[PDB]
């Protein structure tokens, strides 16, 4: 959870395609259908990432954990990238 | 990695057919199937190269290194060409 | 290399059968198998010559030199012919 | 008419594309052009369905009947589905 | 019907070419022409499968049964595959 | 099944003419006519092998077994060759 | 003009490809380039026909006459078809 | 000017896209950028036309004349249409 | 006309080469050059049959009659075959 | 230039294969590689001619002159044909 | 800069493909990524040109000079065209 | 700070998109979320810039300095533009 909040800007920049991430968060009841649609409405990837992160952080730490695992599985070079840049 | 960013325009122009490169990047889990298809959607080789380079730079340095080695194996006259033109 | 670019149209018209030239460029790793096949797909000799020349120019100066030497050995009246017409 | 009010929530969820239904209601002078446009402005299908149903219910029983026949013709598995779920 | 909902992700992945299935669903009036066109608009097979499944689930149980029988006739190795993986 | 997936690249390279294999898979209802035609559309043998293998893996383990037996009967030096190279 | 308004729904269904009709209406200064592009933006033929008809009716009777003559020249079986169905 | 005031309702209905008209009125300093944006904010074409007409009438007769010439150039069937219907 | 609609699927399967039929339909001004080319674009015979039938049915009964006579002259075993299978 | 604009439709119909003309326009820097590819994307000769003419007219009179001379060299019966039909 | 402002309307009409120009302005730090995306969102070339010109004028004279040089390099017949029409 | 106050009108006209600037001011705790949303409510860019400037000036000199550095990083041609025009 802390890792996600501290890297909010970089995740806003480098998260990438959220379709699979949105699918994961929808399978775990973290997001409703309406919320996912609201995330898909955004025009650019930066706005999509901003909306998704800002909405997930509110719900609690568990949602941040599910988001962290989903992003970790989807792309293994970005968690490692930010983990190395924070060092 | 730096070599790829500095030669972004020239690689955008002269990379050529990515099918083997796309196969390498997919075997190393740098790209998903969805991402590879999104790269293949483009109409021209210039747009394909633009999409591939722009997406690979985002992921991190390791992806740039794998891309550099794969392109180096695929064509030895372009790595030598750019290496000579930078001199 | 410059000689090849300057006579692009005339080489497009008068190069002729590329099978031996394609064999040379393939032995020197200038072309892959896929690229040679793509050159062989073209229907007429003008399109074959156009594809081969346009692809060789992209790779770099070394490829143009290998192509020039291969064409020079394969046919001695075309290098001499163009060399005389440029005068 | 009663069937529409009693199943308002389920119709809000499962009506689907209203373009044909909106065309029917416009041909029968139940809706004006402005009202149809206002229904199409909504962002999601749930909001479109809610707006359309809420606007049709006010007008009267006859409008509800026209809506029921139009929806019945458009999709035959939804009237039968809801008729079975009410049992 | 339950079999389709429980295997939503796997069917989303492995359904394949929908032309014959879409033809069946159009012959059985489960889908209109507009809906079939909207399913064919998608760029990849994963998105086509997602749209088709999500739209079929909405209509009701009968549509889910027709989809199950149509997929069963079209490909006998996928119904058998999922039936074996659920065991 | 594992033998086919692990050697996907080598089978992609050395399988050869698929007409007999496609005939086998068509007689066993693993492939439809449309799928066989789509495999035959490809221009090169590498693309034909890639399409066929990628489509067969999706269907399930039984299809992979039929593919292995068909390739084994068609050419006995390729199953033995790959079995020897994995050692 | 009256024939076009009275057959609005049927023309919405059966007009077909508008490219030639749009070219005619553009040659007669009934539509601008922007308007033709807006008609071409639509996804399906039904939406294209709906937009075109709705835009042509607005401008006046002369535009409806030009549309009737252009459609009459382009396809002679549809004017005869609707003319027969109104009888 | 009088023609515009007397046909306020019909112009409110049939004026259409104002982007070109707004561009003309902006080139002639009849409207500022802020006013044009205020016209573009409206949701429907009827409200846009109402806002534009109501704003132009206040400014004076010359603005109404410029509006008349701009509408005359933009669409030649609507000025002729209203002129014929007023007869 | 009815015979064509009732046997739409079987004609989709067994019509075969349309070149002569397309020639007839072009001689009778039922199809334009563009439409014939659009039918010829399809990759398989099933898709060609689908495009041709779907386009001919739209135009009207006369086009279906011309299609019936042309196919009847081209092949006398398919009209007889379907006429026998409907019995 | 005027000859080209006035006969836009006839050139749109009868120009034919543009490969040589495209080569000329590419040699004179009237078209880039991207523009030539965009012209080559079209499916039919009518669409290719429409794209080429519409793009060349935009650039200016000089481009129209180069196009007229190139078409004049490629085919001497079409310039003479249109020159005779305008008389 | 003055040349760009004075020819604002004609440049809005005749600028053409902006991909290369956008590449220039992005390489020279005149535009951010968000701004380039906002320029690419527009539907037509007229709206793209309107957004691009209106945004470039705001930044200052230096941006206008860079834009003028980029447009000059991209197309040499349009700067000459406007230069000749202004005379 | 003085540079910001003296160019308040010009910054009101030419600041542009504040999303990045708002992000900076929010990262530096100059603005809360509520204030950023209140700035985003405004209808035009002129009103957004007016609200942002008017709110930042009140808070103090440090906020004006952070605003100057953020605008300097966001756009390097506007700080140079105003600095040159004040000369």
Residue numbers in the entry:
A (entry chain G), B (entry chain K), C (entry chain D), D (entry chain H), E (entry chain J), F (entry chain L), ...: 451 to 537
Please share excerpts from the published article on this structure:
To test this, we solved the structures of recombinant NLRP1-CARD and CARD8-CARD filaments using cryo-EM, both at 3.7 Å with Gold standard FSC = 0.143, without masking. Similar to NLRP1-CARD, recombinant CARD8-CARD also formed ~8 nm-wide filaments, but these filaments are more rigid and adopt a single conformation. NLRP1-CARD and CARD8-CARD filaments display similar helical parameters (5.36 Å and −100.8 degree for NLRP1, and 5.409 Å and −99.16 degree for CARD8), suggesting a similar mode of assembly from the respective monomers. Despite near-identical helical parameters, NLRP1-CARD and CARD8-CARD filaments have remarkably different surface charge distributions, that are not suggested by their monomer structures alone. By contrast, in CARD8-CARD filaments, the positively charged patches on the monomer are mostly buried inside the filamentous oligomer, exposing a predominantly negative surface. In contrast, the CARD8 Type IIb surface is partially negatively charged (Tyr531, Tyr527, and Asp525), whereas the Type IIa surface is positive (Lys508, Lys509, and Leu512). Hence, CARD8-CARD is structurally compatible with CASP1-CARD but not ASC-CARD. In agreement with the structural predictions, CARD8-CARD, but not NLRP1-CARD, preferentially stimulated CASP1-CARD oligomerization, as demonstrated by the appearance of slower migrating bands on native gels (lanes 2 and 3 vs. 4 and 5), whereas the reverse was true for ASC-CARD oligomerization (lanes 2 and 3 vs. lanes 4 and 5). We further corroborated that CARD8 is the first human inflammasome sensor that is unable to engage ASC as an amplifier. In contrast, CARD8-dependent pyroptosis was not abrogated in ASC (PYCARD) KO keratinocytes (blue bars).
